[model samples]
Target: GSRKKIFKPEELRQALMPTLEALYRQDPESLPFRQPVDPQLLGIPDYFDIVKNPMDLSTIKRKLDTGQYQEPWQYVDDVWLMFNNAWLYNRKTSRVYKFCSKLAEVFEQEIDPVMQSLGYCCGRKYEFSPQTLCCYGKQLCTIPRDAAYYSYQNRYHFCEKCFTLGDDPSQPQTTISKDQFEKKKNDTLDPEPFVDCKECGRKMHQICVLHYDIIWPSGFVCDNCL
Candidate 1:
């Protein structure tokens, strides 16, 4: 199941535009997915044999821009169709599978919840868990700070090492807040202090992005949060 709603060009501007912009901007990983799959270019002669329907981002955007899609839901199907075809042809060992699956996860994580609120439920067919990133991370024990990066979307936290660089425990991680896990005296189980990306508002965690480097949500402020 794909788009359950219809969208005019104007509605597409408000809804799908953000997602289109985001996926294309994803560096390295999203390189191959921006345009339609060209089997001949890659020398995969049987690509169409197994993958009867191969779709890609540019084709979808072209359809939207040219008004080729009478039904917007079909437009959404192209999104999933692109994902499904890759999953069908590629194996877990295939780097194509990794890119395809990761991009699919990104799409689901970013697009589903918002569309679900609008009565579109296609994400139910796949994994849709949120707030599960930054597993070994901590939060502000007890302080007045912004919630974790991407907390508005889900859990975006940083592990203890991000604060201490594998030194002793960080000062803010001494104990849990009274309102939080009161029993766990040494746990940063609250929310991280961060602001969203002013441009994209995409959120991420340090451990999740570059765990050892302490890039994201480390100092707890990106304003853009990407």
Candidate 2:
């Protein structure tokens, strides 16, 4: 049996505001949070219904009262709110909040560089629902509500390929190939020789050392070692 929890839509909104505000402050030019939701273009269903009516809202209500219900609640309207509300209700409230905060932090810290390296952008005028983050366009990738939850839970930011393939080596693959893997490695224009960190024994480039503001006088002492 799963633990039951209750959350209001307003609570979810309030819980997410600080993190969203910080993201906005960090990058005023590209407002990821402010993107308007387009229900039709995003392919999100208006409601998620269990086929044949497995149970009614009264069943959910009874479970809520007795604390036996553990499944996510379904909503018939405002899918984004339903998605986020279910996410909050399904996990430790604080953990979910922290995950959302960490997602914003990752977007602030790494998204631009990662997308730039991939040679893609959301374009200056790309439109998206408030619940999503756009990348390039529909052809590339859009961070849907559930996708964000998965990314935070896994702690690995994913593009379309990674999200579809997942991180597991044993999972059945859709788009990966040996030539693609080899080409990706060989695609680096000016790969630098990496030296091992004295402390952790992890190899890193000199540029990484400087990026961390570490001054190596004699030889390359990686950031972790320093």
Candidate 3:
């Protein structure tokens, strides 16, 4: 929509409040999603263990009310997470799964235009690939490719290193010492080749990729990709 942009925090709240309320009121599909999932009440003792990031409409509302949503995407992510968790535990044949699928369908349809009108292209993604190489870089790495599922105006590729983070522990489980931590800071290891991106296949410099905090470890997708 060519309507006015929403920059102020109050505007986001006002815009989202009705949209959320409409979903809850529109149909029973969203009924189960209107509040937090209670593990004991639902008889799913390990629900918390299986679904690490639980979310619900009421919780999103509270977050919005409390200014926890500094950006629109955070709010959107929580909504998607709510649906994702629902799908995770419930089988396709389960009524809860049907409820969530229908609810998600309505939610997507309702917000697609709103998001476009608000001048947002898309939200964050939770997955990338097996390696750090862009799909092209696989010519060198020889790992079979996975179709990149990323699409954003902030766009960025299918490669080994898209949003990949790895943990490196100390030998004796000690905290990083002063010298080691200091060494982690870049002294600018000069001139590396421009790396291939995972999603769009753009060639970004390795140093520039690190500098931007776009991605690291194996290789990188670009800022535009995610």
Candidate with top TM-score is 3
The digit string of per-residue lDDT tens for model 2 on 1-226 reads 0121344444433333332344435444223223443335746345233211232223333433454422221221122232244343334455434444444344345333432222222101111223454432135665554343223222233434443434466867454432332111111122243454454443344443445655556655543334
> Which candidate has the highest lDDT of all?
3
How far out, in Å, is residue 131 in model 3? 15
RMSD of each: 16.4, 18.9, 14.3
lDDT of 3: 0.58
Tell me the tens digit of each residue's lDDT in model 1 across 140-165: 33212322332211222333233211
Ranking by lDDT: 3, 1, 2
Worst 10 residues of 1 by lDDT: 178-187
Q: Per-residue error at 34 for model 2, in Å?
A: 3.1
**TM-score of candidate 3 to 2 decimals:** 0.52
For candidate 3, the 10 contiguous residues with the lowest summed lDDT are 181-190
Tens-place lDDT per residue, model 3, 1-226, is: 1122235677678877766876687576887887788999978999989999888888988887877776566677688778779888889998889998887666766775565444443222222233332232233533233433332221122232431211233434333332221111111112234555655454344544557544366555555555
TM-score of each: 0.49, 0.21, 0.52
Task: Give lDDT per model, in order.
Answer: 0.53, 0.35, 0.58
